[PDB]
């Protein structure tokens, strides 16, 4: 249910999430009130899920980032795993995945020793084995595409 | 130095990209001017590198997401795959990696059949083999943590 006007707003808000209603208005050719109300409607269906500053993880001390694939040590209860790892703050994302493993997390930590410690917390808190792939370099990311 | 006033700011801006110079400044103990200063400096120093609304990809036509793990076929050519792929736009994220493959892509696409197409285009444009993993569900995504 997304018309061309909304297509223009989200593409803009993707590029600039601090875009102002007035800047948006003159870009879709609408009144600042038209825009405001459009934007909240986008927001309240779950088309826009929030706004975030995109922080440099190295600058705040996260020098090591890794993908960790996790699989149930044994898969008989439905899966707690996302729920119970929500309160580990160093886990940034959590996807279920088709194939041999069940979830893939992306994880951000200060150093190698801090990674080893974190893998222990993960193994123990969701009762899961882990396969780790360290990121050496991010070429670009969250480059959100609106068609 | 990340002065733990600069530290309080980024935690604020990561949870809220449109939090406003004022509503910040209050929770931050400050003038709406030295708020505005660091914020301009924090962006200048590469610490906050941009603001983005977070759009739901289904909502916008991307019903299938995938991690796609690529390795170049000819080790005697310059290894420039991130750069060769950068204009392909459904590649949201491109990360080099220490594992079995050389990079991982997060890629978003209309349908399973559209994915087959994209992969073919990835293979012919970098000169890479592709191994891909399908995301069934995102439990959470980009929860950024500031020590
Ligand atoms: N990896 C499983 C799918 C899966 C997703 N989440 C899970 C949680 C537990 C066990 C399996 C799963 C498969 O490909 O079929």
A11 and A43 both lie in a single domain: yes
Pocket probe for ligand 1: among A74, A78, A79, the residue whose CB has the most ligand atoms within 8 Å is A79
Strand B91-98 to strand A91-97: parallel, antiparallel, or no bridges (unpaired)?
A: unpaired
Are A50 and A73 in a shared domain? no
- List the end-to-end C-alpha distance of chain A, in Å, as a whole number: 14
Q: Domain tally for chain A?
A: 2
Closest atom of ligand 1 to A101 CA is 1
The domain that holds B46 is classified in CATH as 1.10.10.10
**10 Å Cβ neighbour count for A5?**
13
> Are both A72 and A117 inside the same structural domain?
yes
State whether B90 and B111 are in the same domain: yes
Query: Does any domain span residue A140?
Result: no
User: How many CB atoms sit inside 10 A of residue B17's CB?
Assistant: 22
Total beta-carbon pairs less than 8 A apart between chain A and chain B: 204
Helix ranges, chain A (H)? 4-15, 21-28, 32-44, 81-85, 112-122
**Within-domain flag for A146:** no
- Confirm if B116 and B107 have CB atoms less than 8 A apart: no
Residue A60 sits in the same domain as residue A115: yes
The three-point CA angle B18-B4-A52 to 5° equals 20
Number of alpha carbons in the 13 Å side-chain half-sphere of residue B53: 24
Q: Are B110 and B62 in contact (CB under 8 A)?
A: yes
Report the residue count for chain A. Answer: 147
Contact A100, A71 (CB under 8 A): yes
- Residue A83 belongs to domain with CATH number: 3.30.70.920
CA of A70 to the centre of ligand 1 (A): 10
What are the strands, taking DSSP E only, across A44-102?
48-55, 64-72, 91-97
By C-alpha distance, the chain A residue nearest B144 is A92
**Does the residue B140 lie in any domain?**
no
- Both B70 and B124 in one domain: the answer is yes
> Closest Cα to atom 12, ligand 1: which residue?
A102
- Residue B142 contacts A where some CB pair is shorter than 8 Å: yes
A103 neighbors B53 (Cβ within 8 angstroms): no
Residues B54/A51, Cβ–Cβ less than 8 Å: yes
Are residues A102 and A115 part of one domain?
yes
Cβ contacts of A113 within 8 Å, gap of 6 or more: none
**Same domain flag for A23 and A35:** yes
Half-sphere exposure of B114 (CA within 13 A, CB side): 12
Query: Obtained via which technique?
Result: X-ray
End-to-end CA separation in angstroms for chain B: 14
CB atoms within 10 A of CB A74: 8
Print the domain residue range for A32: 3-54
| Residue B139, H or E segment | strand B128-140
> Are residues A71 and A117 both part of a single domain?
yes
- Residue A44, chain B, CB below 8 Å: the answer is no
Gap from B75 CA to chain A (nearest CA, Å) = 19
* C-alpha span between A128 and B4 (Å, rounded): 36
Q: What is the resolution of the experimental data for this entry, in Å?
A: 2.8
Phi and psi at residue A107, to the nearest 5° = -135, 145
Helix A4-15 vs helix A32-44: crossing angle, to nearest 10: 80
Q: For helices A21-28 and A4-15, what crossing angle results, to 10°?
A: 140
Same structural domain, B131 and B96: yes
């Amino acid at each position: 249910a997304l018309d061309d006007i909304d297509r223009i707003l989200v593409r803009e808000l993707a590029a600039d999430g601090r875009a102002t209603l007035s800047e948006l208005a003159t870009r879709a050719g609408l009144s600042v009130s038209a825009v405001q109300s459009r934007v909240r409607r986008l927001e309240s269906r779950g088309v826009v899920q929030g706004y975030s500053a995109r922080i440099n993880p190295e600058a705040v001390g996260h020098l090591l980032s890794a993908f960790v694939a996790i699989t149930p040590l044994d898969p008989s209860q439905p899966d707690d795993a996302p729920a119970r790892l929500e309160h580990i703050e160093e886990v940034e994302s959590c996807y279920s995945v088709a194939g041999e493993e069940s979830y893939v997390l992306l994880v951000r930590v200060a150093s190698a020793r801090a990674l080893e410690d974190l893998l222990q917390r993960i193994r123990t808190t969701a009762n899961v084995r882990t396969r780790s792939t360290i990121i050496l370099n991010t070429f670009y990311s969250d480059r959100q595409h609106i068609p």
